[PDB]
Amino acid sequence: EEREDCWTFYANRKYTDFDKSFKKSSDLDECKKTCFKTEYCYIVFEDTVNKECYYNVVDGEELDQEKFVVDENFTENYLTDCEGKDAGNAAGTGDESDEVDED
Numbered sequence: 001e002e003r004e005d006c007w008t009f010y011a012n013r014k015y016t017d018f019d020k021s022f023k024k025s026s027d028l029d030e031c032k033k034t035c036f037k038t039e040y041c042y043i044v045f046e047d048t049v050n051k052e053c054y055y056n057v058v059d060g061e062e063l064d065q066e067k068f069v070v071d072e073n074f075t076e077n078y079l080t081d082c083e084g085k086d087a088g089n090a091a092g093t094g095d096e097s098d099e100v101d102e103d
């Protein structure tokens with residue numbers, strides 16, 4: 001749906017581990033839908049190069065951007081202070097940190 005969960009972008013990051021269990025299919029819609037689906041609805045990891053979407057389907061509320069280190073080929077965006085829809089749109093996924101072009 002056009003009312004998404006709003007993912008707040010902070011930085012290109014990874015703490016170099018994907019144990020939190022993510023699934024990758026890149027459909028913006030699919031990702032929202034997956035987010036809305038679990039409990040957690042909150043962390044999403046995107047592959048900057050492949051333009052892919054991994055959605056965190058488990059509790060990783062403790063995944064903090066600032067304890068996270070930079071994985072250059074990934075963009076990290078997490079639902080920050082939304083927990084509802086109403087007007088849900090947030091185009092910031094891989095938007096911050098321009099290296100080559102817009103990435």
